Design an enzyme around this catalytic site. Structure first.
Site, PDB file in Angstrom:
ATOM      1  N   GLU A  59      45.436  53.439  46.315  1.00  0.00           N
ATOM      2  CA  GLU A  59      46.230  52.555  47.165  1.00  0.00           C
ATOM      3  C   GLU A  59      46.203  51.116  46.657  1.00  0.00           C
ATOM      4  O   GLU A  59      47.113  50.335  46.939  1.00  0.00           O
ATOM      5  CB  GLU A  59      45.710  52.556  48.601  1.00  0.00           C
ATOM      6  CG  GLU A  59      46.627  51.806  49.567  1.00  0.00           C
ATOM      7  CD  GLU A  59      45.879  51.060  50.662  1.00  0.00           C
ATOM      8  OE1 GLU A  59      45.185  50.075  50.338  1.00  0.00           O
ATOM      9  OE2 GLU A  59      45.987  51.450  51.846  1.00  0.00           O
ATOM     10  N   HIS A  60      45.147  50.768  45.925  1.00  0.00           N
ATOM     11  CA  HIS A  60      45.015  49.431  45.364  1.00  0.00           C
ATOM     12  C   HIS A  60      45.809  49.237  44.073  1.00  0.00           C
ATOM     13  O   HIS A  60      46.233  48.127  43.761  1.00  0.00           O
ATOM     14  CB  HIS A  60      43.545  49.107  45.085  1.00  0.00           C
ATOM     15  CG  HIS A  60      42.806  48.575  46.272  1.00  0.00           C
ATOM     16  ND1 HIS A  60      42.114  47.385  46.237  1.00  0.00           N
ATOM     17  CD2 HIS A  60      42.649  49.067  47.523  1.00  0.00           C
ATOM     18  CE1 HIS A  60      41.562  47.166  47.417  1.00  0.00           C
ATOM     19  NE2 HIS A  60      41.872  48.170  48.215  1.00  0.00           N
ATOM     20  N   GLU A 136      35.897  44.202  49.977  1.00  0.00           N
ATOM     21  CA  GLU A 136      36.544  44.615  51.209  1.00  0.00           C
ATOM     22  C   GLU A 136      35.621  45.471  52.067  1.00  0.00           C
ATOM     23  O   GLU A 136      35.781  45.529  53.280  1.00  0.00           O
ATOM     24  CB  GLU A 136      37.835  45.370  50.914  1.00  0.00           C
ATOM     25  CG  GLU A 136      38.873  44.558  50.167  1.00  0.00           C
ATOM     26  CD  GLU A 136      40.198  45.296  50.043  1.00  0.00           C
ATOM     27  OE1 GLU A 136      40.165  46.523  49.803  1.00  0.00           O
ATOM     28  OE2 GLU A 136      41.268  44.654  50.176  1.00  0.00           O
TER      29      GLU A 136
END
Ligand SMILES: C[C@@]1(c2ccc(Oc3ccccc3)cc2)OC(=O)N(Nc2ccccc2)C1=O
Lengths: 443, 54
Positions: A59-60, A136
């Site tokens: 997703e990154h 994160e």
């Protein structure tokens, strides 16, 4: 124009399947602006001990460039057209979508396909995001609400796949290979498991056309077009208590196993949750709120906030509530919260459901407030129900619900069940499991 | 931990465990612990040969 009429006059949702197995659906409106994206039936639940946090790692990179167009090029092109590129990855569902001018629906579709199919997975970008993701995880570690829900899954589904978090482990993130991410993508981002959804001012046939042009790569074998059924995740009545009296407030989450997407009872559970509702210290309503629990919270200052939920999944789910309270009011809060759950199963009123039903309707209508939210519904719906469900159908189902029905369904999933509990923070006042377990009967 | 149900249950258990010997003694050996001398009306003039307390 009556509520009914408006529900019937809503443009229908068109669906068409390509030979490769991909499904293209969209709802047409007269908006110069639109949202289109691909909803993949993938997520942490599909990962295992070795590749947990891969779908997230991916997703990154899904936005750092493709083969046809490196990073800067990819970004500039999207930025310069005023389009918005967002997306997310969860436990059973992933998504990459773009908000743009209907006038660009086709170029977008090309972009989407390029992202899901030809991600550059730049060897150097990978090591770079490896550090970003690690930051994160520390940021999210301070998000009690999310730490609490992770823990809730960690114990409620201990030993299984839903126990894992979406972001993954520290060891995985520190050692995931360019090959692992690649493997992830090839294994999961596959036509039959994806859904091209779009909403706004777009031609279904133009959408499906660009779709045919860019979402090609058909499969040969049978193993490539079959959607794998995941192994069941066992629910466990249990608790995880993470104590830290240094934290200012305490978070508590209690839940029973839910039915799973396809089950009709979900309409009833959502009505039920509507009766108990939710609350937080800024609800002007105050001591006059219809939700009894909310009223008591105000009168006795039981919590800072509380919320019910009915999280679904393919074959299971979590039906429960979560609250935030001062170390010294946890016990009374839990007392009243469980009390209300007992009331549901035992003494629900027609008035109660009448209100909850209205509340639920306006809530479903609110989740279709814009092109992105509507697009999300389509993606999710086909991916979970294998078909879109109109507001008119929902309303049809919601209308059939009555007090007796709420009681039986609630009694069914709640009464005398062994819950899953997650408590974080200054939780000394929260009584033991046995005491809580007793709050599960009589009421 | 809360007294209930941890120790209420533990206590009720301890109760029935000690209650067995008690009842067994009382029902199968009522006089194991008493002095036969107490089955004889007090006599101010005769003191028992072996005065022994409970
Ligand atoms: C049951 C018993 C008893 C109970 C408690 C005692 O403890 C005391 C109570 C008051 C004052 C001093 C001691 C003492 C004897 O009462 C009683 O008469 N006896 N019998 C007895 C026999 C010989 C000498 C002394 C006593 C007891 O054992």
């Amino acid at each position: 124009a009556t509520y009914a009429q408006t529900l019937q006059n809503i443009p229908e949702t068109n669906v068409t399947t390509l030979d490769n197995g991909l499904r293209v659906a969209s709802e047409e409106s007269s908006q110069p602006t639109c949202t289109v994206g691909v909803w993949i039936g993938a997520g942490s639940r599909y990962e295992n001990e070795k590749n947990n946090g891969a779908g997230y790692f991916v997703e990154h990179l899904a936005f750092k460039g493709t083969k046809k167009r490196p990073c800067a090029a990819f970004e500039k092109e999207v930025e310069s057209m005023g389009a918005h590129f967002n997306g997310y990855t969860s436990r059973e569902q992933t998504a990459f979508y773009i908000k743009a001018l209907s006038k660009d629906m086709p170029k977008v579709v090309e972009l989407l396909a390029d992202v899901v199919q030809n991600c550059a997975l730049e060897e150097s970008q990978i090591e770079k995001e490896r550090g970003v993701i690690l930051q994160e995880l520390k940021e999210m570690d301070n998000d009690m609400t999310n730490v609490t829900f992770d823990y809730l899954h960690a114990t409620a589904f201990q030993g299984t796949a839903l126990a894992r978090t979406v972001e993954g482990t520290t060891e995985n993130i520190k050692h995931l290979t360019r090959a692992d991410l690649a493997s992830y993508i090839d294994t999961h981002f596959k036509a039959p498991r994806m859904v091209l959804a779009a909403a706004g001012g777009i031609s279904h046939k133009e959408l499906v056309d660009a779709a045919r042009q860019h979402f090609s790569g058909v499969s040969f074998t049978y193993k490539e077009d079959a959607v794998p059924i995941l192994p069941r995740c066992r629910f466990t009545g249990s608790e995880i208590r993470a104590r830290d009296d240094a934290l200012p407030v305490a978070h508590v989450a209690l839940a029973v196993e839910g039915p799973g997407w396809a089950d009709p009872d979900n309409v009833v559970l959502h009505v039920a949750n509507a009766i108990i509702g939710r609350y937080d210290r800024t609800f002007g309503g105050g001591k006059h709120l219809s939700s009894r629990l909310a009223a008591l919270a105000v009168e006795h200052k039981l919590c800072h906030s509380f919320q019910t939920f009915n999280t679904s999944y393919s074959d299971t789910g979590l039906f429960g509530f979560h609250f935030v309270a001062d170390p010294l009011s946890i016990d009374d809060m839990m007392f009243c919260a469980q009390g209300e759950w007992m009331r549901l199963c035992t003494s629900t009123t027609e008035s109660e459901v009448k209100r909850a039903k209205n509340h639920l309707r306006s809530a479903m209508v609110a989740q279709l407030d814009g092109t992105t939210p509507v697009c999300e519904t389509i993606g999710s719906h086909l991916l979970n129900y294998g078909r879109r469900i109109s507001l008119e159908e929902w309303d049809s189902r919601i209308s059939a619900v009555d007090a007796r029905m709420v009681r039986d369904v609630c009694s069914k999933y709640i009464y005398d069940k062994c819950p899953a509990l997650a408590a974080v923070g200054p939780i000394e006042q929260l009584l033991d499991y046995n005491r809580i377990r007793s709050g599960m009967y009589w009421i | 931990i809360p007294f209930h149900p941890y120790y209420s249950f533990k206590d009720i258990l301890g109760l029935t465990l000690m209650l067995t010997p008690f009842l067994t003694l009382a029902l199968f050996s009522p006089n194991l612990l008493g002095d036969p001398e107490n089955f004889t009306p007090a006599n101010p003039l005769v003191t028992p040969p072996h005065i022994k307390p409970e």
